[PDB]
Each structure stands twice: as C-alpha cells, then as structure tokens.
C-alpha cells in the first residue's frame, strides 16, 4: 500500500548523509548501493540523501539518524515515503550559518574547524533548509543551509564554494537541537529500551487510540538499578524521542521545601505535566520522597508520601500522561507504590557488560579527538563494575588531563578559547591511561 | 621578615640606586615611623599557603590538578563541553589540616573563598539555618571562580 512507504527505525551508521533499506526493498525499489534519494517526512518537509544496504533492517523499516529525523520532523515510528533522485547535480554556491546556541563558548574559524573537515571529499548531498551536526573541539556545531545554488538541492563537491556569513541565526521552536538526549546517547540498555518503547508507543504517540479504546495502558514506569546507570537519561530521551512533555521532579529537591510547601509543589508539578500532555513525569530520587516501609517518620514525611499516593491514583484520562521514578531497588521504596494502578510496571537497569562499556565509552567521546593509540575496546575490557557515571567520568578526565598537558603549558587558555586549537588537542591512550590509575 | 614570634612585612617605598639595588654593609636604611595601610591587591604573607602545609604532598598533588583548569581557566569551560570535578570531599581525623588544605588552595589559586560550618548552620532557628546555606552558596557564585568549604559536613 505504497511500496515506497516506510517506518523511520534507528541507524547503524552514524553519518548524516546515509540511510539504510533491505537489498529486497533496494531491488523492489530499484535503488543502487549509492544512489542519492529523495526522503518526504511531516510538515510537507524533505531531505536528500546516500542509501546503503542494511540485512539487519527489514522490508518495511528505513534506518536513519536523528539529525535526518529532524530534518524530516518525523520521529522514530513514523513513515515517509522515499524516492530516487539522479537528477541531482554538483553544487556551485552554499550559504550556511551556525544555529547560535551551539557555538557560544568559542571563538575562531568554523569553516576551516567545522564546516571544511565535514565536507571534503564526502560529496554530501544537501537540500536548502537542512540542518545538520559537525563535531569537534569537545563539542558539536549546528548548522543550517540557508541557500544552495543549483536549489533546492545538490551535492557539496570539492569545487562547491561554500559561504558562512558571520551572523549566528536563531533556533525556531519546532527545530529541536541535536545536543538533546536522544536513545543514540544510551549505551548497554537495549532490552530495557525495547520494553520501555512499547509501554509509552501508543499512549504518548497515539493518544486518541484510548479516547476510542477501553483497554488500560501502563501508567507507572518504575527504574531500579544502582546511581549512574542512566535512568534520568532514558526517561529523558523516551520523551523527547517521542515529542512528549517532560517534567522532572527530584526528591530531594521537593523534599527540602518548608512543610506543605512541599505538597503543594508535588500537585502544581502533575498538575502541569496534565497541561501539557502527552507527558512524562520522572521523579529523580523516589525513595528521598517515599520509604515508609520502617524507615517513614514524620508528620509531614508521611503526609507527602501519602500525597504522593494520591496524586498517582489520580492519574488516567485524556492524552495520556506516564510517570516513570528511579530508585536503586525495590527495598528502598514504599510498597503502596507499587499498587497496581501506581507503578505497575518496573524496569531494572543493570551494570554494563563488557560491550556495554564499549558502547557508553564511544557515545561520550564522540565530540573529541582521540588519538590513533586509544584504545577503547581496552578500556571497555578493564572497567568491569562500571556504570555509565563512572565511564563519563573516565572520559572527562582523560581530556582534562591531555588538556593540562598539552593546550596548558602552551598556555593560551583564560580569555576566549579558539576553535582551532581545542579542534588539534587529541587525547591519547596515555590519558585515558593516567585516568584509569586515579 | 620572621621574629619575635610573628612575621612583620616591609615595603621598598624607595631606593638610592633606582629602582634597583643590593643591600650592602654600606647601605644606609631609612625606615622613618609610619606603617603604610596594605593595598587590595596585594596579599598579606600571614595568610595560607601550600608552604604552611606539611605531610600531605600525594593529596595536594591531586587537589591541584582537580581545581587548577576549573579555578584558573574558567573560559575553556565556557568553550568547552567537558565536566570538572565538582564537589571534593575531604577525608580524615581531626586537626588534620582540611580546612587549611581548603583554604590554601583557594588563596593559592586566586580563587574566592567562603566557608561554611555546621555546627553553625545547624544552630540557626529552623527555616533561618537553610536560607543560610543558600545566601552562602548565592555568594560563592557571585565571586566564582570560588570554593565553597562545608566544615564539619
Ligand atoms: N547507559 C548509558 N549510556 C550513556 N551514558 C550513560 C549511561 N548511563 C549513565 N550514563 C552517564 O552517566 C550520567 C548518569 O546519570 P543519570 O542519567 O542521571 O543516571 P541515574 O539516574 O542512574 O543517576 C548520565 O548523564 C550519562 O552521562
Ligand atoms: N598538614 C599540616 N601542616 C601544618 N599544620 C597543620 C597540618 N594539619 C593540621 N595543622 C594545624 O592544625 C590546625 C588544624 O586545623 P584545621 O586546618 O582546621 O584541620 P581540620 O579541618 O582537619 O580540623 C591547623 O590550623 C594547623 O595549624
């Protein structure tokens, strides 16, 4: 019902330009290891780009990244519908600026740091209006096509000139930015994902099914695992990768209002996510909130508890909002909060395997340049009892201390750090070295 | 200059050979009566310093690399993406020089210092004693780079 029709899944390959089918959907399509495509998405949007073949993809499903995704203002789920495009040609003029919040901080050349290293030689299709990520110099730059000559789309080539006219343009509203948590950011969590995914698709995405429907969707989504396993960031990124409302609440944070303040800031919170529904209310620490089993005391500790039952209870209606809380086990929380109709559903994040790491280790240095001698499958295999914290800690200081090292005595630091020079600085394994024996 | 059990500090106002010289058997000193006030910028030597701390050498090795890029280079985080350490906790009995370690660091590092005890905090009437922590840490950011000391934690 439309060959040409297909399901926006993740991608493999982490390059803006590329997209992945099956080979018998690349046959049935007629489209070649290379051929250059022409995507159609929401809002009556487009992209151009590379396709590839993909066998873990199948038939119906279209692998691309976020920053396509967006470029498409379609979210993961979604279909859009692919067409080939020979007719595209070699590029003479490219006008493009940088998205304003994503290159306060620096100073310096971006084409030569950015836009230069990004296109040379890739013969990147691109299509006016496209937004599109480059990293580097611990960070990554946005950037916008405000033009191309032969329009609306074509190739950069290595004869295409390329304008960036000194002026940052603004972010519009509906142009989410790619430095957002996204489940491209997860690592080790995959089973859990795929759980979570399929409690939130259709009452998050399809609110009006239960307006029509009878059936009960998941209403409390419950995390257990130890500190720094990610489980704000999974909570943050189903949210945003799923154009819901979200609201964080944490603990200790409510818990340090005067009493009754504290209350009245639990209901103004749920009240809001209703407003603003689909949403997703994530409470931080749980257990600095709800503990009762022996440990509750206090005339104010257990009315908010309490406060909190009620609040759950009062849950269930139109578009549909999820609550999802985050606690190190079961234990710590009082158990009227798992009472069917509160949190029902529980989810327990585990420690990262060996892979696990592997993958963590690579999402947080994505922004820097390591050295051909770093080794992170190494790294990954000496961390054993690590979680996601502990890895981004690691990375953090392997960069800091090669920014010690090197930049440091150098000595051109504390006045308005220049894109160049944290674009050469590399890290090599030595730092990830001296790190891992702190 | 170090005696009667304190250190007294002088000021060159002026010297014959100028603004150069060496102090010789010869060399007249004139030190006529009257102390000069200190000025702002100019710290006083009776203050802490890395050389007032002894034994600890590993643990202000470490210290100091944490605080230097955060405390001395501010910009680069504002340039980069990249989390300093940000709470450092200080283990040990008491009378072992934490508080001293602390604050030689900020006076070493130019760094604004602001010291919090709770046994202080704590004797505050109820509600008094957290507007006070906020009030306190409102100010360490007001003069960042800066360290913020919770004494006895
Ligand atoms: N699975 C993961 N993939 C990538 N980063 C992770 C993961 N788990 C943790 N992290 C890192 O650790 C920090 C963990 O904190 P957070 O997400 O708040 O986790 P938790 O709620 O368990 O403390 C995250 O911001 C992220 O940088
Ligand atoms: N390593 C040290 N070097 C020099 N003096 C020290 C040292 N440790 C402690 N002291 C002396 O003991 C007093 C210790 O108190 P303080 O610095 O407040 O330590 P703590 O916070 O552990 O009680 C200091 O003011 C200093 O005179």
Same mark, same amino acid.
């Given at each position: 019902?439309?060959?040409? #029709? ?21 046959? /049935? ?50 279909? $859009? ?11 003479? +003029?490219? !006008? ?27 013969? #990147? ?5 496209? $937004? ?22 074509? =190739? ?39 759980? =979570? ?8 995405? !399809? ?30 990124? @189903? ?40 949403? $997703? ?15 509750? !005391?206090?005339?104010?500790?257990? #009315? =908010? ?15 549909? @909002? ?34 696990? #790491?592997?993958? =963590?280790?690579?999402? !947080? ?54 894109? /160049? ?5 590399? @890290?090599?394994?030595?730092?990830? +070295? ?5």
């Amino acid at each position: 019902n439309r060959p040409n #029709r297909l399901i926006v899944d993740e991608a493999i390959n982490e390059d803006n330009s590329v997209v992945s089918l099956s080979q018998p959907k690349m046959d /049935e399509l007629q489209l070649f290891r290379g051929d250059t495509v022409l995507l159609k998405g929401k809002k009556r949007r487009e992209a151009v780009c590379i396709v590839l073949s993909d066998d873990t993809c199948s038939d119906e499903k279209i692998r691309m990244n976020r920053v396509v995704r967006n470029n498409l203002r379609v979210r993961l789920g979604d279909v $859009i519908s692919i067409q080939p495009c020979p007719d595209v040609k070699y590029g003479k +003029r490219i !006008h493009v600026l940088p998205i304003d919040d994503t290159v306060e901080g620096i100073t310096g050349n971006l084409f030569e740091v950015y836009l230069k290293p990004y296109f040379l030689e890739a013969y #990147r299709p691109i299509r006016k209006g496209d $937004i599109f990520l480059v990293r580097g110099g611990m960070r990554a730059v946005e950037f916008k096509v405000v033009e191309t000559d032969p329009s609306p789309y074509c =190739i950069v080539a290595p004869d295409t000139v390329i304008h960036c006219e000194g002026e940052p343009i603004k972010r519009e509203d509906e142009e989410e930015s790619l430095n957002e948590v996204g489940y491209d950011d997860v690592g080790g969590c995959r089973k859990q994902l795929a759980q =979570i995914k399929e409690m939130v698709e259709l009452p998050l995405r !399809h609110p009006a099914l239960f307006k029509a429907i009878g059936v009960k969707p998941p209403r409390g989504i419950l995390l257990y695992g130890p500190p720094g396993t990610g489980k704000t960031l999974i909570a943050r990124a @189903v949210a945003n990768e799923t154009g819901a409302f979200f609201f964080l609440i944490n603990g200790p944070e409510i818990m340090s209002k005067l009493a009754g303040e504290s209350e009245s800031n639990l209901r103004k919170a749920f009240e809001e996510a209703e407003k603003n529904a689909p949403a $997703i209310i994530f409470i931080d620490e749980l257990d600095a909130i709800a503990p009762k089993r022996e440990k509750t !005391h206090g005339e104010v500790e257990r #009315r =908010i508890v309490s406060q909190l039952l009620t609040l759950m209870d009062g849950l269930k209606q139109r578009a549909h @909002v999820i609550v999802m809380a985050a606690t190190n086990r079961p234990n710590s929380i009082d158990p009227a909060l798992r009472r069917f109709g509160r949190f029902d559903r529980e989810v327990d994040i585990g420690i990262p395997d060996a892979t696990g #790491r592997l993958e =963590i280790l690579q999402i !947080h240095t994505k922004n820097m340049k390591l050295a051909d001698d770093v080794d992170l499958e190494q790294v990954a295999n000496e961390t054993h009892g690590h979680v996601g914290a502990d890895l981004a800690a690691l990375c953090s200081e392997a960069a800091l201390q090669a920014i010690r090292k090197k930049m440091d005595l150098i000595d051109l630091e504390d006045e308005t750090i220049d894109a /160049e020079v944290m674009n050469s600085l590399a @890290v090599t394994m030595d730092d990830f +070295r001296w790190a891992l024996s702190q």
